[PDB]
Design a protein around this ligand. Structure first.
Ligand SMILES: O=C(O)CNC(=O)C(=O)O
Ligand SMILES: [Mg+2]
Ligand code: NI
Ligand SMILES: [Zn+2]
Length: 331
């Protein structure tokens, strides 16, 4: 078995290997990359996502989210307080202000220490989940707006034609902005490209060990666990690496820099934080190997998780027994 310790793997495809996205995902899996839950892909030196980022300031962040924490430094939840709209140029100035800017630090490890020590005492503002793309239409390789759609994958594998669409999302971050522990909707893959700015640190649990993280989470968030049998789908809970180590939960960590792709694999729990002003783009995708994970994915039916239009068909076709209860949660 390849990669039996479930380490995060880093890949350096050539320009020729960068042509066929599905084939390269399958290659990475042949080398065991999925066992980690997360892989890094460094594009060939010849590739670029677009010519420049000099003209992005007028993009609108219609509903910036202030991420307010409750709990203790290593075990906390966050809620998202809606703020007034602002442009990307306005947000970048805010991120660089004395109130929100990255502190002086020695290296990524020192900054990680400062994040875990101090995150809860601040409420950074995140521009998340903004439909759109920064890939130039002429970029033909690994263009996250031109991937094969998950509806077309389900149709190819299973023969059933379904409604729904699959488009990318932009994320504009600042110091301490935080993504809580989660897997993707329907335990899909994700791919994330860091277009510009400061790094993003990731933490990930191997898919084969995801139930260990769930059991810890039920212990650490006991009221939430009673409210919903899949409360990590709410995307609000954080657990530090120190706490994970204290409880014997297998995980790994890596820092993504501008110009790099990360791929999350089905049922790979992940969480992380931004180091300073940045912009990422991400989208979900599927492969044939996903289908079995989609059929087994947990679902939130308490009403909190509320998701896209396109998840309806995935539940309806892959999980017909759960469909009625899940849909009640959506309404
Ligand atoms: O970048 C972020 O805030 C969160 N991204 C992801 O969880 C992802 O790409 O799967
Ligand atoms: Mg603009
Ligand atoms: Ni994710
Ligand atoms: Zn729920």
């Amino acid at each position: 078995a390849q990669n039996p310790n479930c380490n995060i793997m880093i890949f350096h495809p050539t320009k020729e290997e960068f042509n066929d996205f599905d084939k390269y995902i399958a290659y990475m899996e042949s080398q065991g990359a999925h066992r980690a839950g997360l892989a890094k892909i460094i594009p060939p030196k010849e590739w670029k996502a677009r010519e420049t980022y000099d003209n992005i300031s007028e993009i609108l962040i219609a509903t910036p989210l202030q991420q307010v924490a409750s709990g203790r430094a290593g075990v906390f939840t966050q809620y998202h307080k809606k703020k007034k709209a602002m442009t990307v140029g306005e947000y970048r100035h805010l991120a660089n202000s004395k109130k929100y800017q990255t502190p002086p630090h020695q290296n990524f490890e020192d900054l990680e220490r400062k994040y875990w020590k101090n995150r809860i005492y601040n409420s950074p503002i995140y521009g998340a989940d903004i439909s759109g793309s920064l890939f130039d239409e002429n970029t033909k390789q690994w263009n996250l707006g031109h991937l094969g759609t998950i509806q077309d994958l389900l149709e190819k594998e299973c023969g059933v034609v379904i409604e729904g669409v699959n488009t990318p999302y932009l994320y504009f971050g600042m110091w301490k902005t935080t993504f809580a522990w989660h897997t993707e909707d329907m335990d899909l893959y994700s791919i994330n490209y860091l277009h510009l700015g400061e790094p993003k640190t990731w933490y990930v649990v191997p898919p084969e060990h995801g139930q260990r993280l769930e059991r810890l989470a039920r212990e650490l968030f006991p009221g939430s666990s009673r409210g919903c049998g899949a409360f990590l789908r709410h995307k609000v809970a954080l657990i530090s690496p120190t706490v994970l180590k204290e409880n014997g939960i297998p995980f790994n960590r890596i820092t993504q820099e501008a110009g790099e792709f990360m791929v999350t694999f089905p049922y790979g729990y992940h969480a992380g934080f931004n180091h300073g002003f940045n912009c990422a783009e991400a989208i979900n995708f599927a492969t044939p190997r996903w289908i079995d994970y989609g059929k087994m994915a947990s679902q939130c039916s308490c009403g909190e998780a509320r998701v896209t239009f396109s998840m309806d068909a995935f539940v309806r076709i892959l999980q017909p027994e759960r469909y009625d209860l899940w849909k009640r949660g959506q309404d």
